[PDB]
RNA sequence: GCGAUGAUCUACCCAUGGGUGGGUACAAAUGGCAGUCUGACAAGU
């Protein structure tokens, strides 16, 4: 009385037509349990009749949600409709083997001529299927089942536990790592090219140590010679001639003592200067972007302290959760000076707590804390 | 439609048992009173259970904590008044979080275990 | 489609064929190809019936309506399925809506070149309207006036 | 110990776990995603060169993770091997799941289960970071209801504290566990029922298990770490039970 | 001659090492970011440059399933990428974040291109400054030699055995001060000649190549009248090539 | 017009000025450690 069974997988349903039945009175027996484990006979016990894949990960997700919740999905309805032989329900109704006693009623109300069985007998059939699996399908289904398992598992998890999007923080973490190391290696390359081009012209080096402006000045000056009063006014359109620096560099170039060098060195070093200039632009841009994300995700802690410093705390702690979680002395770990510092540590622990666990932050409440600490400092 | 971020919160009778047990506890020094006190007991693994209030402004200061409680398997409750909790825990300002600590050498032992089980049933 | 072909061109139990098509569609609401041949099959139905009544009468817009209803349901369903391919920000929402509308209306354009032809294209553009697409199909209206 | 000592790593008897010897000895397992301590635990580093690379071992605080308390109190066969799979009922975090996932390693996979939400959120974070886990965030009382995601888990670990612990494992294990597969329970007297006392509680739970066919291979108390706890290792037979 | 400046030679090569180092670290970091969006990638493809090129191509797994990846990646691997994009565990990223990561990727590509630009620059400069050595032993190795010894007069100032041993000075000095046996290769390992030699032959070829390198180095270095055509180096390479293949042909077994 | 949302508490001179000493993180360098292997035979018949 178990003619058909329904089995399902992450990527697609299947229906099997059982060709026999393992006997029923004695199905805790040593022998029949072994026969379920030993594929050499369970093949005789079941053969595949159909397999209906899924269309996309999204539809597989919504389908798995439904088969959890106990309602029949559209693909499920269609596959059963295409499979099951019909009957006049009053005499000799058909039988299907399912594991969800909860699902049973929905199937019955849809098809008034099908009986869902879930005994220990049918759970054993499905266990045999769950065990052997991919050998049974004869190959109809391509795909890294296991990969689909992990993916769908994550998706179903997130969907129900209600993960949020803005509350991401690793972006803040990696952002601050970038800004720090980026300032470091930008300065490295800045003094690199500074020494290198001072080989040709060290007067500019001793004049301006400012790096990005150094890069732009290198971008203008090709060699220490092709500089006129027109170039003087051009540097005036650039940084400053009122400071006299344009006159300084033109005089030092007229008297220039750095040995002039190969043309190809001028072009490639100009390429280098363009590189460092674009990189500095990039760092400033990313800094502003960090400001944006901080004021969006956690403006509370930031307004209490500052964008970059709040990112320092979040990174060094590990994440926004952990930083909010831990008590208000580790936040100090990460005379009047000590006193005001500890007070601020407690209040920033506060700000972090609210600013994480909420669904969105409150700059005004952050400002209230800021003003309270400010009035205490004034009390000092 | 969603349960509020304070659930659970007790009815008045259970409020009475909680606050009374808290008071005797504070008089017998089995009690770490204060939000950071509570978080640090939870960390140190010496907590019998956790009371806290659900009217402080804002609520999220202490809403952080039951995360630790659920992970570590210790029960937690929200009483409807930091003012009442303060007057019952015996200090000068409103209190929003307190933790009853473990020690079996406790002359209120059976009292606290019965009340803790009441809480577990609330959940 | 091959089973439909055998069943039809050797015997043409049109009820059997329509059942095959509707079942296959229910299983594969993603395949615009299959929607295409279902539409052209119902066209074959209509044309065969029209010619048979013609020859019978010689010896001795319901149809556009059904075709365009098929068109309508195909549009709605494929649009939904194409959204659900990669199923969240308002801006990407907007651009992907733009892209799926582009795809669906390209499929409509293929339906038109597939193509009572005047009435069919008329209702196609009606359901359409219910930018560059706008200008292309108003040019199409001009070409219809030519036709 | 401190932050400057150099330790000596050593392959523990159980595959996957590792003694770290020094002036003072520790239990340490591999780490999958290097460079991010999960919960404030120190991580030994080693370096091996072909040019160099850094690999990273992680201490397993037995006070804080129950299975690790058991390992350090000595079990005979911990069924969790560097290749197999696992089901892990009751992981309010990855606090033990991080380690079990690391031991199980890249080729095996490990399933986590939770009922709660917010612990589930943190579990999602960890599952994002690490591949081995797949997280199931459902009420653990309906293997029917998440049957979607599991095929022949090769062992089970039970951490839950619900007084129907034996029934809940019976259900999930029947549905999922491979035949002749290591069930491991972490029994808790008070969590099961307070008025009865520890030894009777352990007895009665082992009885329920021995009736639902999980032949209990051994028992352990893990005394010097936590009180009234226990770890009952059993082997799932289902055929030739007696 | 203004282009006869080993000072910028050494500056350029040191810059090459550094540029490689921070290229690698930025590759690792952008891997972290975009893998957080899409974590199958880093394990599927491994070239930082190619990875960045996919980043440039797409910004969402939909555009992954749509666009074509013919030039960057062969087709089996790219359909692997498409199926992963369909089913990936990682989350999805917002517009501004995508803009910023895309711009990082442009920066990575720019450092790449600039690096090989610099390498071929150094190639031309090197054949200009010391042609015979360049032809003999190899651009990169010769550049490193002149770098390590500082000035070209110094590098030619040194004798042959040194230029053989010049890299692994550490193990050399350890062996000397504890009476073990000396190392043999040092920096001239990566010379292509040794790169085809095999074992004890690599040692012997390292020795002979080192001596000829001393000759060529010196002649490029000091000669008042230079043809810049690498004649001595070229004939030297002929010589060592011959010595090699004859040594190789000598098989040690019995027949 | 105080506080559990946190009170109190974690080297030497010249009377809130200057000079000395130590302890961690970052950079510098042509400081140091710190010194550039041997020197006629080999291979084929």
CA gap A57, E65 in Å, rounded = 13
Residue pair B101/B31 in contact (Cβ under 8 Å)? The answer is yes
β-pairing verdict for D181-188 and D229-236: antiparallel
β-pairing verdict for A12-18 and A4-9: antiparallel
Question: Which residues on neighbouring strands pair with residue D218, listed in sequence order?
Answer: D233
In chain D, the residue whose alpha carbon lies closest to the alpha carbon of A11 is D148
CA gap A249, A201 in Å, rounded = 10
Q: Which residues contact E150 (CB under 8 A, 6 or more apart)?
A: E10
CA gap C22, C38 in Å, rounded = 9
Please give the C-alpha separations between residue A210 and each of A25, A191, A201, C86, in angstroms, as whole numbers: 91, 10, 16, 49
Q: Which residue matches tokens 């990682």? A: E90
Q: How far is CA A314 from the centre of its chain?
A: 17
Burial A69-84 (b: 16+ CB within 10 A, else e): eeebbebbeebbeebb
Residue C9 is classified by DSSP as: I
Chains C and B lie in contact, requiring 3 or more CB pairs less than 8 Å apart: no
Nearest nucleotide (C1') to the CA of residue B89?
A: F4
Give A35 CA → F9 C1' in Å: 75
Six-digit token string for A9: 């997988």
Q: Is E54 exposed, middle or buried (0-12, 13-18, 19+ CB in 10 A)?
A: buried
Tell which of D110, D122, D134 to mutate to test the A interface (max A CBs under 10 Å): D134
Calculate the dihedral angle through the C-alpha atoms of E131, E132, E138, E144, rounding to the nearest 10 degrees.
-70
Nearest protein residue by Cα to C1' of nucleotide F30: E150
- Phi and psi at D54, nearest 5°, equal -115, 125
CA gap C10, C27 in Å, rounded = 25
Q: Is E83 on the interface with C (CB under 8 A)?
A: no
Please give the C-alpha separations between residue B23 and each of B49, B55, D7, in angstroms, as whole numbers: 14, 20, 50
Q: Which residues of chain C are within 8 Å of residue E86 when distances are taken between CB atoms?
A: 86
The data reach a resolution, in angstroms, of 4.6
Q: How far is D240 from chain A (nearest CA, A)?
A: 6
Q: How far is CA C69 from the centre of its chain?
A: 8
Q: Which residue matches tokens 């952990």? A: A322
- Sheet containing D229-236: give its strands across: D133-136, D110-113, D86-89, D155-158, D181-188, D229-236, D214-220
Calculate the dihedral angle through the C-alpha atoms of A285, A289, A291, A297, rounding to the nearest 10 degrees.
-170
Which secondary-structure segment (H or E) carries A226? Answer: none
What's the domain range around B114? 1-123
Helix runs in A56-142, H state only: 57-69, 74-83, 104-110, 120-132
Residue D122 has a CB neighbour count (10 Å cut-off) of 23
CA-based nearest residue to E95, from C93, D205, D30: C93
Give E149 CA → F33 C1' in Å: 20
Question: Which residues on neighbouring strands pair with residue A4, listed in sequence order?
Answer: A17, A96
β-pairing verdict for D214-220 and A94-97: unpaired
- Phi and psi at E22, nearest 5°, equal -75, -25
Residue B69 has a CB neighbour count (10 Å cut-off) of 19
Which secondary-structure segment (H or E) carries B99? Answer: strand B97-101
Assign A197 to helix, strand or coil.
Answer: helix
Q: Which residues of chain B are within 8 Å of residue A328 when distances are taken between CB atoms?
A: 36
Elucidated via? cryo-EM
Domain tally, chain B: 1
CA gap E246, A313 in Å, rounded = 67
- Phi and psi at D65, nearest 5°, equal -125, 125
Give C48 CA → F31 C1' in Å: 102
Assign A106 to helix, strand or coil.
Answer: helix
Residue pair B30/B101 in contact (Cβ under 8 Å)? The answer is yes
What value does the CA radius of gyration of chain E take, rounded to a whole number of Å? 24
Q: How far is A354 from chain B (nearest CA, A)?
A: 5
CA gap E118, A269 in Å, rounded = 10
Burial A96-107 (b: 16+ CB within 10 A, else e): bbbbbeebbebb
CA gap A51, A59 in Å, rounded = 16
- Phi and psi at D7, nearest 5°, equal -110, 175
Residue pair D32/D59 in contact (Cβ under 8 Å)? The answer is no
Residue D95 has a CB neighbour count (10 Å cut-off) of 21
| Secondary structure percentages of chain C, helix, strand, coil, to 5 | 85, 0, 15
Assign C123 to helix, strand or coil.
Answer: helix
CA gap D127, D139 in Å, rounded = 18
Q: Which residues of chain C are within 8 Å of residue E60 when distances are taken between CB atoms?
A: 86, 92
- Number of C-alpha atoms within 13 angstroms, CB side, residue A311? 24
Q: Which residues contact B12 (CB under 8 A, 6 or more apart)?
A: none
Nearest nucleotide (C1') to the CA of residue B32?
A: F4
Counting DSSP H helices and E strands in chain D, the numbers are 6, 12
Q: Is E234 exposed, middle or buried (0-12, 13-18, 19+ CB in 10 A)?
A: middle
Six-digit token string for A300: 């509370």
Nearest nucleotide (C1') to the CA of residue E154?
A: F36
Q: Is B7 on the interface with D (CB under 8 A)?
A: no
Please give the C-alpha separations between residue B5 and each of B59, B106, C73, E85, in angstroms, as whole numbers: 9, 33, 44, 36
CA gap D237, D11 in Å, rounded = 30
CA-based nearest residue to D236, from D161, D176, D148: D176
Instruction: Dump the DSSP string for A13-78.
Output: EEEEEESS---STTTTSHHHHHHHH-HHHHHHHEEEEEEE--S-HHHHHHHHHHHHHT---HHHHH
Assign A277 to helix, strand or coil.
Answer: helix
Assign D216 to helix, strand or coil.
Answer: strand
Task: Report the residue from A52, A59, A78 with minimal CB separation from C84.
Answer: A59
- Phi and psi at D59, nearest 5°, equal -70, 150
CA gap C139, A296 in Å, rounded = 47
The nucleotides of chain F lying under 7 Å from a protein CB are: 2-10, 30, 35-39, 43-44
Please give the C-alpha separations between residue C48 and each of A73, C21, C34, in angstroms, as whole numbers: 38, 18, 21
Task: Report the residue from A58, A78, A82 with minimal CB separation from C87.
Answer: A58
In chain D, the residue whose alpha carbon lies closest to the alpha carbon of B5 is D118
Assign D87 to helix, strand or coil.
Answer: strand
Tell which of A185, A186, A259 to mutate to test the E interface (max E CBs under 10 Å): A185
CA gap A236, A217 in Å, rounded = 11
Assign B18 to helix, strand or coil.
Answer: helix
Which secondary-structure segment (H or E) carries D100? Answer: helix D97-104
Q: Assign residue E179 a region: left if phi > 0, alpha if psi is -120 to 50, beta otherwise?
A: left
Q: How far is CA E123 from the centre of its chain?
A: 12
Calculate the dihedral angle through the C-alpha atoms of C78, C82, C87, C90, rounding to the nearest 10 degrees.
-100
CA gap C135, C105 in Å, rounded = 13
Residue A290 is classified by DSSP as: H
Residue pair A311/A200 in contact (Cβ under 8 Å)? The answer is no
Give E250 CA → F45 C1' in Å: 14
Residue B92 is classified by DSSP as: S
Tell which of A22, A127, A155 to mutate to test the D interface (max D CBs under 10 Å): A127
Does any strand F atom come closer than 7 Å to the Cβ of E112? no
CA gap A202, C44 in Å, rounded = 86
CA-based nearest residue to A43, from A112, A113, A138: A138
Does any strand F atom come closer than 7 Å to the Cβ of B90? no
Residue pair D183/D177 in contact (Cβ under 8 Å)? The answer is yes
3-state secondary structure chain E: CCCCCHHHHHHHHHHHHHHHHHHHHHHHHHHHHHHHHCCHHHHHCCCHHHHHHHHHHCCCHHHHHHCCCCCCCCHHHHHHHHHHHHCCCCCCCCHHHHHHHHHHHHHHHHHHHHHHHHHHHHHHHHHHHCHHHHHHHCHHHHHHHHHHHCCHHHHHHCCHHHHHHCCCHHHHHHHHHHCCCCCCCHHHHHCHHHHHCCCHHHHHHHHHHHHHHHHHHHHHHHCCCCCCCCHHHHHHHHHHHHHHHHHHHCCCCCC
Sign, Cα dihedral of C125, C130, C135, C136: negative
Interface of D with A in 54-73 (CB under 8 A): none
Residue pair A90/A104 in contact (Cβ under 8 Å)? The answer is no
User: B: neighbours with 3+ CB pairs under 8 Å?
Assistant: A, D
Six-digit token string for C65: 């309506």
Which secondary-structure segment (H or E) carries B50? Answer: strand B47-53
Burial A338-352 (b: 16+ CB within 10 A, else e): eeeeeebbebbbbbb
Please give the C-alpha separations between residue C41 and each of C8, C21, C36, C46, in angstroms, as whole numbers: 10, 9, 9, 9
- Phi and psi at A4, nearest 5°, equal -115, 150
Whether residues C89 and E94 touch (CB distance < 8 A) is answered with yes
Which residues from the 172-231 window of protein chain E have CB within 7 angstroms of nucleic acid chain F? 172-173, 176-177, 182, 184, 207
Q: Which residue matches tokens 């979040």? A: A314
What value does the CA radius of gyration of chain D take, rounded to a whole number of Å? 18
CATH number of the domain to which B42 belongs: 3.30.1330.30
Six-digit token string for D35: 């460079």
Which residues from the 311-350 window of protein chain A have CB within 7 angstroms of nucleic acid chain F? 328, 335, 338-339, 342-343, 346-347, 350
> Long-range pairs for A261-264 at CB < 8 Å and ≥24 separation?
A261/A199, A261/A200, A261/E2, A261/E3, A261/E5, A261/E8, A262/E2, A262/E3, A262/E5, A262/E125, A264/E121, A264/E124, A264/E125
Whether residues C27 and A78 touch (CB distance < 8 A) is answered with yes
Tell which of D50, D109, D128 to mutate to test the E interface (max E CBs under 10 Å): D128
Please give the C-alpha separations between residue A227 and each of A254, B26, D206, in angstroms, as whole numbers: 9, 84, 93
Residue pair E51/E42 in contact (Cβ under 8 Å)? The answer is yes
């Amino acid at each position: 009385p178990i003619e058909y069974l329904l089995f399902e997988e992450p990527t697609g349903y299947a229906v099997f037509k059982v060709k026999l039945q393992q006997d029923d009175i004695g199905s805790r027996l040593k022998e029949v349990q072994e026969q379920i484990n030993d594929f050499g006979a369970f093949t005789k016990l079941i053969e595949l009749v159909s397999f209906a894949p899924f269309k996309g990960a999204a539809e597989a997700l919504e389908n798995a949600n439904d088969i959890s919740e106990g309602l029949v999905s559209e693909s499920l309805k269609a596959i059963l409709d295409l499979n099951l032989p019909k009957a006049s329900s009053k005499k000799k109704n058909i039988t299907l083997a399912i594991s969800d006693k909860n699902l049973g009623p929905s199937i019955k109300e849809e098809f008034p001529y099908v009986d869902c069985i879930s005994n220990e007998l049918a759970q054993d059939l499905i266990r045999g299927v769950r065990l052997h699996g991919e050998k049974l399908f004869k190959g109809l289904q391509s795909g890294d089942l296991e990969r689909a398992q992990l993916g769908l598992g994550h998706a179903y998890s997130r969907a129900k536990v209600k993960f949020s999007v803005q509350k991401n923080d690793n972006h803040i973490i990696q952002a601050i790592a970038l800004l720090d190391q980026l300032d470091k290696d930008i300065n490295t390359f800045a003094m690199r090219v500074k020494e290198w081009y001072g080989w040709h012209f060290p007067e500019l080096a001793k004049l301006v140590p400012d790096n990005y402006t150094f890069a732009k000045l290198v971008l203008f000056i090709k060699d220490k010679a092709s500089l006129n009063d027109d170039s003087l006014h051009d540097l005036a359109a650039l940084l400053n001639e009122d400071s006299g620096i344009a006159q300084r560099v033109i005089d030092n170039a007229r008297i220039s003592m750095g040995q002039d060098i190969s043309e190809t060195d001028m072009e490639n070093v100009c390429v280098f200067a363009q590189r460092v200039a674009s990189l500095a632009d990039y760092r400033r841009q990313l800094y502003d972007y960090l400001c944006e994300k901080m004021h969006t995700v956690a403006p509370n802690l930031s307004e209490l302290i500052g964008e970059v410093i709040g990112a320092r705390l979040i990174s060094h702690a590990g994440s926004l959760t952990n930083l909010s979680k831990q008590a208000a002395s580790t936040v100090q770990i990460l005379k009047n000076k000590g006193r005001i510092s500890r007070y601020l540590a407690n209040k920033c622990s506060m700000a972090s707590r609210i600013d994480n666990y909420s669904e969105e932050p409150s700059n005004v409440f952050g400002s209230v804390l800021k003003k309270q600490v400010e009035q205490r400092l004034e009390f000092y | 439609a969603p349960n509020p971020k304070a659930f659970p919160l007790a009815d008045a009778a259970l409020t009475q048992q909680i606050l009374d047990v808290v008071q005797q506890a504070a008089n017998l020094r089995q009690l770490k009173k204060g939000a950071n006190e509570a978080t640090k007991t939870l960390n140190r693994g010496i907590s019998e259970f956790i009371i806290m209030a659900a009217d402080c402004e804002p609520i999220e200061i202490l809403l952080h904590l039951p995360l630790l409680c659920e992970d570590k398997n210790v029960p937690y409750v929200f009483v409807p008044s930091r003012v009442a909790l303060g007057r019952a825990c015996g200090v000068s300002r409103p209190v929003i979080a307190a933790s009853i600590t473990t020690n079996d050498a406790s002359a209120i032992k059976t009292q606290i275990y019965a009340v803790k089980d009441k809480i577990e049933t609330l959940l | 489609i091959s089973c439909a072909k055998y069943e039809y061109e050797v015997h043409a139990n049109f009820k059997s064929c329509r059942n095959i098509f509707q079942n296959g569609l229910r299983f594969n609401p993603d395949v615009p190809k299959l929607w295409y041949e279902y539409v052209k099959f119902e066209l074959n139905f209509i044309t065969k019936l029209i010619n048979r009544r013609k020859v019978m009468g010689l010896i001795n817009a319901l149809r556009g309506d059904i075709a365009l209803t098929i068109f309508d349901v195909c549009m709605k369903t494929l649009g939904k399925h194409y959204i659900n391919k990669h199923k969240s920000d308002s801006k990407m929402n907007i651009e992907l809506n733009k892209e799926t509308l582009n795809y669906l209306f390209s499929e409509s354009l293929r339906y038109i070149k597939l193509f009572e032809r005047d009435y069919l294209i008329n209702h196609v553009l009606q359901f359409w309207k219910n930018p560059e697409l706008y200008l292309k199909t108003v040019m199409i209206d001009i070409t219809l006036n030519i036709r | 110990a401190r932050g400057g000592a150099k330790v000596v790593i050593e392959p523990h008897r159980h595959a996957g776990v590792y003694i770290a010897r020094g002036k003072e000895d520790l239990l340490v397992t591999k780490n999958m995603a290097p460079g991010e301590s999960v919960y404030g635990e120190k991580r030994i580093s080693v370096e091996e060169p072909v040019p160099p690379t850094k690999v990273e071992y992680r201490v397993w605080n037995p006070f804080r993770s129950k299975l690790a308390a058991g390992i350090m109190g000595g079990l005979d066969e911990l069924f969790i091997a560097p290749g197999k799979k696992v089901l892990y009922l009751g992981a309010a975090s990855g606090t033990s799941v991080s380690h079990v996932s690391d031991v199980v390693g890249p080729e095996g996979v490990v399933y986590a289960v939770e009922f709660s939400h917010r612990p589930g959120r943190e579990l999602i974070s960890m599952a994002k970071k690490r591949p081995n886990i797949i997280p199931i965030i459902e009420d653990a009382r309906h293997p029917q209801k998440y049957r979607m995601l599991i095929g022949m888990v090769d062992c089970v670990f039970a951490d839950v504290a619900q007084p129907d612990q034996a029934r809940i494992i019976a259900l999930n294990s029947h549905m999922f566990l491979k035949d002749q597969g290591g069930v491991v329970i972490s029994i808790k007297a008070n969590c099961i029922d307070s008025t009865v006392d520890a030894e009777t509680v352990f007895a009665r739970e082992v009885q329920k298990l021995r009736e639902e066919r999980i032949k209990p291979l051994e028992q352990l108390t893990l005394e010097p770490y936590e009180r009234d706890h226990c770890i009952v290792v059993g082997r799932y037979m289902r055929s030739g039970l007696k | 001659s203004a282009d006869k400046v080993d000072v910028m030679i050494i500056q350029a090569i040191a810059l090459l090492d550094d540029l490689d180092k921070e290229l690698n670290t930025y590759a690792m970091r952008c891997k972290e970011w975009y893998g957080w969006h899409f974590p199958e990638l880093a394990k599927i493809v491994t070239d930082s440059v190619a990875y960045a090129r996919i980043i440039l191509t797409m910004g969402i797994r939909s555009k992954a399933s749509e666009t074509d990846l013919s030039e960057i990646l062969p087709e089996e691997i790219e359909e692997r990428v498409k199926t992963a994009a369909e089913v990936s565990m990682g989350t999805e990223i917002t517009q501004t974040d995508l803009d910023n990561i895309n711009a990082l990727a442009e920066q990575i590509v720019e450092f790449a291109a600039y690096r090989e630009q610099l390498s071929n620059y150094l190639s031309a400069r090197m054949k200009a400054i010391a042609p015979n050595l360049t032809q003999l032993v190899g651009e990169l190795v010769g550049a490193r030699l002149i770098a390590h010894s500082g000035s070209l007069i110094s590098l030619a100032k040194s004798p042959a055995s040194t230029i053989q041993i010049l890299g692994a000075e550490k193990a050399l000095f350890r062996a000397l001060k504890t009476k073990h046996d000396t190392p043999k290769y040092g920096l001239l390992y990566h010379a292509s000649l040794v790169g085809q030699a095999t074992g004890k032959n690599k040692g012997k070829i390292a020795r002979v190549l080192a001596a000829k390198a001393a000759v060529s180095l010196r002649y490029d270095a000091l000669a008042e009248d230079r043809d810049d055509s690498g004649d001595i180096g070229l004939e030297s390479r002929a010589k060592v090539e011959n010595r090699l293949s004859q040594l190789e042909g000598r098989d040690l077994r019995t027949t």
